[PDB]
Write a protein that binds this ligand. Structure first.
Ligand SMILES: Nc1ncnc2c1ncn2[C@@H]1O[C@H](COP(=O)(O)OP(=O)(O)O)[C@@H](O)[C@H]1O
Ligand SMILES: Nc1ncnc2c1ncn2[C@@H]1O[C@H](COP(=O)(O)OP(=O)(O)O)[C@@H](O)[C@H]1O
Ligand SMILES: NCCC[C@@H](N)C(=O)NCCCC[C@H](N)C(=O)O
Ligand SMILES: [Mg+2]
Ligand SMILES: [Mg+2]
Length: 353
């Protein structure tokens, strides 16, 4: 039995904990927040700030199999970079890839340097899409029909938002499974479903990882626009939401793959359907789709229900949010599970949908 130490107990932390448990690992969480969202979901919870008390983390490293940073606190990441040689287990992270992926302008220069199409900067005609250079979860992302001078302003590319993860070991780059990112009126993601192989997106994602070169995990997001595929961002960190869909739809556990990349290496290259989504139980049980930004304001997140083909997680807070995961052999079986899972909320809580 392996043990993984997660630094960060919010959405990334949840995804990593979830897949770690599927792999049969024990999950130790470190988080500076005594109310960390998944503090009760992990097997052990240590509350400390790793920048203030790095000796505690270094000591933990002596008794787990890997440390996985799952936060986007740049002070945390850079500090961990500074002490990484002192760890007694592998740190599953690519610090140089993260430096590029975290800054959207730098990422766009990287795309251009390798010939990868990306949305036009500073179009002369609306709509524009504007976003901060260094956020995630579509925080500050808006369509527009005095921004800070650093705001990204791009052509608005209409079409499907599609995601692919890549795990590299420095030499080989394992391109995993395409997923559709379903977006809400805030441009946040409320649902994810799997997509058929897309050889162009796969080669692009391969070359993005290969040119870094990636030793770790990164996801690549693109819009299938009217004039072709345009890469909008990369993120060299463990993602949320998509890895669960990747797990049911493809049978690949991104945590086990990432761990392999730092131990024996990875090699390049199921076909089930899965629906992953978030629903808030708003005033008198009207179910409303919500994105991650909503889920991340919760106080407590853990397993609510499971039966064959159905898992439900409850994120407590100002209005309960349910994360629902349905899977099955095709869309039809999965759609049936989604119905059964909704009726579990319908009969239990008087939910409406
Ligand atoms: N230095 C740190 N030590 C321990 N936990 C940390 C540190 N920095 C961030 N975290 C934890 O990682 C989690 C995710 O952080 P972050 O990615 O910055 O998300 P957010 O901006 O939504 O709070 C949080 O629960 C945070 O408390
Ligand atoms: N140029 C664009 N045109 C149209 N939609 C976009 C564009 N850039 C981003 N988006 C939308 O906004 C969301 C957030 O963009 P992204 O670049 O992924 O920032 P974040 O790091 O927050 O995810 C995307 O999933 C997509 O829905
Ligand atoms: N592969 C597609 C990924 C799209 C998106 N769902 C995502 O990974 N979001 C990461 C947000 C995490 C914010 C914060 N660092 C936290 O951990 O809560
Ligand atoms: Mg992003
Ligand atoms: Mg994004």
């Amino acid at each position: 039995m392996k043990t993984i130490c997660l630094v960060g107990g919010k959405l990334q932390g949840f995804e990593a904990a979830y897949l770690s448990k599927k792999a049969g690992m024990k999950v130790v969480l470190v988080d500076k927040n005594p109310q960390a969202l998944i503090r009760n979901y992990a097997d052990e919870f240590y509350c400390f700030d790793v920048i203030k008390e790095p000796e505690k983390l270094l000591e933990l490293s002596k008794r787990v199999d890997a440390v996985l940073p799952v936060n986007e606190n740049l002070a945390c990441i850079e500090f961990l970079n500074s002490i990484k040689e002192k760890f007694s287990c592998p740190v599953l992270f690519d610090f140089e890839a993260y430096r590029i992926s975290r800054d959207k302008k730098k990422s766009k220069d990287y795309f251009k340097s390798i010939g990868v199409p990306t949305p036009q900067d500073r179009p002369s005609k609306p709509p524009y899409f504007v976003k901060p250079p260094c956020e995630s979860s579509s925080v500050g992302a808006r369509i527009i029909y005095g921004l800070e001078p650093d705001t990204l302003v791009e052509e608005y590319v209409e079409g499907e938002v599609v995601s692919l993860e890549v795990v590299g070991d420095g030499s080989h780059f394992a391109v995993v499974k395409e997923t559709l990112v379903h977006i809400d009126e805030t441009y946040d993601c409320h649902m994810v479903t799997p997509l058929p192989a897309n050889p162009l997106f796969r080669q692009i994602s391969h070359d993005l990882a290969a040119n870094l070169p990636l030793k770790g995990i990164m996801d690549v997001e693109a819009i299938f626009g009217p004039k072709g595929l345009r890469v909008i961002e990369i993120d060299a960190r463990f993602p949320s939401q998509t890895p669960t869909v990747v797990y049911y739809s493809s049978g690949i556990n991104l945590i086990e793959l990432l761990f392999r990349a730092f131990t024996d290496g990875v090699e390049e290259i199921e076909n089930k359907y899965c629906i992953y989504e978030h629903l808030m139980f708003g005033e008198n049980g009207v179910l409303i789709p919500v994105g991650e930004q909503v889920l991340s304001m919760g106080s407590d997140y853990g397993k609510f229900y499971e039966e064959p083909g159905i898992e439900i997680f409850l994120c407590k807070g100002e209005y309960p949010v349910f994360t629902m995961v349905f899977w099955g052999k095709d869309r039809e079986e999965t759609g049936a599970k989604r119905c059964k899972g909704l009726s579990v909320l319908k009969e239990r809580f008087g939910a409406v949908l």
